[PDB]
């Protein structure tokens, strides 16, 4: 479902979850959204960070959560 | 012959008739002298018992010269004898008596290897051995004229302690503060016998995030010779410890800590140059986060990233490419100190050209 | 620049309309430098609108006016109002979507430092406050790992000085310090990375000051003093570090496990050894809480086993006997490893195989594949000895024959 | 008076059979006078220097009389003649300190320098006097 | 089971315990207090036994029944109501022959409460074992009454200013009367020290704690002051002189004015005070 993933944007902004997802299918589905790449993000899954292997089951996952969507340059 | 000999040693040096059982092993134990054949068969039950009371206290006072000279496998048994066979208290002495005859230490790690069965099953089996190591280095060893088994003991017996380690770190620091034995020798414990050193690798890291933020002059700067030594000819796995002690124990770490880290991550990408290599992005990741330097400290920074970037052909993409971006980055706007930050790059970086298209990437930084 | 209108339309009239943070960046920097009401100021201390404007959105209006005064400096009793005002729907209302908490604020800290104690009393206060008295606890669960994201994306200061600040004075800093149920959730977790033995040490003076305060209270003042010594907070912390576990977010519920190893570590054995029984139970409880790591723990026993070189005695024996009588046993998950403490420990201690074998018996030696691995072993290993080495053939022996019960039937040794 | 009475200190504290007794008696008979004109012209001085005296002093009067009694009570009869000398020369000294000097309870709020440490040097040397004496005779 | 050993070994108390009456007396009191230890957890049981008990100690004493029936008080009537110590210690003043006045002269020995004196009064078994019994319960009242000295606040002010003045009463017996039957080359000489040494160090604390916050507590610390400087401020200097190798010369317990020096000092600071004045000197 379009879990409400409220990170560093600043809105609640929404997805369309996959029980068996991409281990950032969210982080794709708000790279091309958001904007901010695919790589360069982090997302504070229930108090852990996304494990970007396994999909959003294994965070114990939801609909309409929040994701804790941030994200820094390491180049930069 | 003696395989008959030690052979049925073994077997009644258990279960044997213990009433004239200990007066015939007091018998071989007066014929223990002529051979080193009954040395290790006696030391089995003179392991597991003894044939009598201060006759196994007497026959330990063959062990202490029972062995000056003894070959390598007679070593590891004959040490276990003259330590383990009966540990009195009084027997701490009798560990400086071997700390004097046999211990120059030296196929050769198996050596290492029977020399750390004995030492190390003593180390953690009868607690008085702690104290007899420390009386071998502290008492006359520790300061005077050191052993390179000094310092291989002190990684078995001086930092390899369950629970006395804190007055092993006080005696391991006390001549290690004094000049007593200091770091010139570290350099060939952890270059000759290294997994001999490295099993207690965690030892070693002790060594280097304690004694290595010290104040100490060459305290200090022979501990720095440990990461130094420890990180370069060990072994590629905890080599992400080095490298990344000093990378991230210098990110956060100190004035004293952050000139040990550059001047760590600047012994590597100067002394080092092909294993700056594997943990390249540790040190990127060190890159970042950048709230302590001066034209001199994140110009260090810049110093070893540019140190290692513009060295290698196939292997300097994305750190190059990491390279340009973060100076556009902080030093293409703003931040508080964040031009300060960018233009000390980007100088820094040309410094880097200064050694070619790196003037273009000139360009890219006046850009 | 632009951000006047927070006066009387964006914190007053027709405001809260998002973007506007670019309406900030005219000159998001009005609320460690700080303060243009018309005048680098402190964090909310200031001039007529960047001042006045802090009922409703002084420093951040949105959350992205949040972050965006952050990306503008412009942070003390604006956060803090605001986080009286919004709690969990305004401040922190999810972790992300009302979470201007667990974003906005960590951003916050992000870009003085004695502010976050606040800030723990800002999480503190209903947070927490309210579970003394998508998921309301849920809510809880996000913004406590999310503050925990944030402490440690802080220490990636030493506040702890100011924690040791907060540690001991006057009973101000003296006994409320460490109080926080999540306050020691803050401690652990930041401790967890690294350079934290300090914060260790100081969670160990707790516990010492714990069991000082009630050895002494029991007399010392009741009808002076009242209770709650140190708060009280031994089984305190204890209860909370279950809480952590139980909301499941792992922020520092697997970090919570090196406060045993600094429980029984220096274990002796009223004060100087109520901390060893501290750290045993604090490990038992987490051993039956965090149930996916409990094979990485139970295999941290083991340690305890290895240097049990005369060292482990009630240490190894009440915790291998609580862990493996709750575990099924590492099931040979253990047993890979675990077969010659036999004369390895009683090699030390002859109170070490009784007590290593009458705890491991009733998972490996009902277990049967390392049951004859195990008791092999001693009559092997009770062979030939001292007597500290036929003690423990004599222990073993009457180990095993006492633990496979007898009778036909299928017997100790007729099955 | 500060650099004097400090490297007065310092000598006294650095001079520690019957030839051996002659010479603690002679050097600390030197010494005893040093510190008797010493202590007579800080009758002389006033409160920046008073505070000099009251510290050095409290340092001397325990440098000896921990540092020294183990000659004085060691010579007590049979060197003995100048038990009485070096006791007298302390006296002296001891009544300006306390009978005098310590009047900054009368220094005051800047007397903390030798108030409580002065006191206890001087309980302290004349018990181990009357014990450097009865364990003599 | 106090019934049993109540009614047994008062029985023996009165008419029993002759000469032939010291074992079962030692086991009397180690019973009766080894059962009290939860003998009354509770108000009713508890003030019953220390009823009993002091109902007991109104009664003649004994070599033996000196040391333990008197732990046995101090653990009841000081959990009872743990401020009893300064209750305790109260009664601990009467004419057990000690510099009372006069120098010689019997100022306190154990007889404050005068049938308390009963117990620990009679003879040089009163003296000897009374100045340990004071000097014990003088070091719990200490570390306890100078426990208080963290716990900022004002109902520890109150607690301290009370207890403290209770302290202080009670060192005002046992220095103005008699220590160790003003002597008792060991135990009173000890007493007198330690207990002196250690009443400078709390009234430290709380001249202290004036030095952190000092807005208006002169009035309370002013009795407390006064107090402290007319009972026992000048009598140690009486003491220093009716108390004062070969003999073994250790009296390490003279340097405890080092912490009378301790009390000036703090006093010293006298920040809008001027407690010397308020105080003597």
Redesign the interface.
Known sequence: MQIFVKTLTGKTITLEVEPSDTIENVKAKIQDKEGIPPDQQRLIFAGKQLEDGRTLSDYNIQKESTLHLVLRLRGG | PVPIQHDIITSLPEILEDSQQNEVARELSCLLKQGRRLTVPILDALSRLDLDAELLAKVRQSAMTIVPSVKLEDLPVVIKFILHNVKAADAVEVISDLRKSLDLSSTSQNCVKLLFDVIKLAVRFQKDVSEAWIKAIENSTSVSDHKVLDLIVLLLIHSTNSKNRKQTEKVLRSKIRLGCMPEQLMQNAFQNHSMVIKDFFPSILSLAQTFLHSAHPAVVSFGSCMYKQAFAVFDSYCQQEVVCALVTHVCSGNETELDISLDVLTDLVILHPSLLLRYATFVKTILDSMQKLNPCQIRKLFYILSTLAFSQRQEGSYIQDDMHMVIRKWLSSSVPNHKQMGIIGAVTMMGSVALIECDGQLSTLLD | ELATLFVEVIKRGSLSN?KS?ELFSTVTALSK?SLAYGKELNGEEKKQLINTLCSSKWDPQ???????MFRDIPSGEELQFVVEKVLRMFSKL??????PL??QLL?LSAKSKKTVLEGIISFFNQLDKRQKE?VPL?QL??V???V??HIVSAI?QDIGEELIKHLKT??QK?PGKALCPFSVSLLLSTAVK??LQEQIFDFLKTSITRSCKDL?IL???????DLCPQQYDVTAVILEVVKNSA?????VTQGLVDLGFSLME?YEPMPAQQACKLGASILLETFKVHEPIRSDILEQVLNRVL?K???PVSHFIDLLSNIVVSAPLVLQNSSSRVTETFDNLS??PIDTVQGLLRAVQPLLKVSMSVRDSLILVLQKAI????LD?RKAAVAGFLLLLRNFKILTQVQADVH | FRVMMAQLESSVKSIPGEVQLEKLLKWNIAVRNFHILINLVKVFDSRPVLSICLKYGRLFVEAFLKLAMPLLDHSFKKHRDDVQSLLKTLQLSTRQLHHMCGHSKIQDLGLTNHVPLLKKSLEQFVYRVKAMLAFNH | QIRQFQRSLVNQLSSAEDDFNSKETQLLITILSTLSKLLDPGSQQFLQFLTWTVKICKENALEDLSCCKGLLTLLFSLHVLYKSPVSLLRELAQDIHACLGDIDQDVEIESRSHFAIVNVKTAAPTVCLLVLGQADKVLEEVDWLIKRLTIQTQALEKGVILQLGTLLTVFHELVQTALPAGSCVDSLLRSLSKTYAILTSLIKHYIQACRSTSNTVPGRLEKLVKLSGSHLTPQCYSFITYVQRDTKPIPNLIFAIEQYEKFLIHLSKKSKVNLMQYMKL
């Open positions: 998002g943070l430098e949105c959350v992205i006016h949040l972050a965006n999810d972790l992300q979507e009302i979470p667990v974003y951003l998508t849920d669960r996000h406590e790992g999310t925990i994201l990636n006057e009973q003296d690294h350079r002494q007399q010392a003042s009741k009808f002076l003093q909301f499941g977010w792992d922020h220096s240097t070189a005369a060292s090699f030390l062979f030939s000895r001292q080495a």
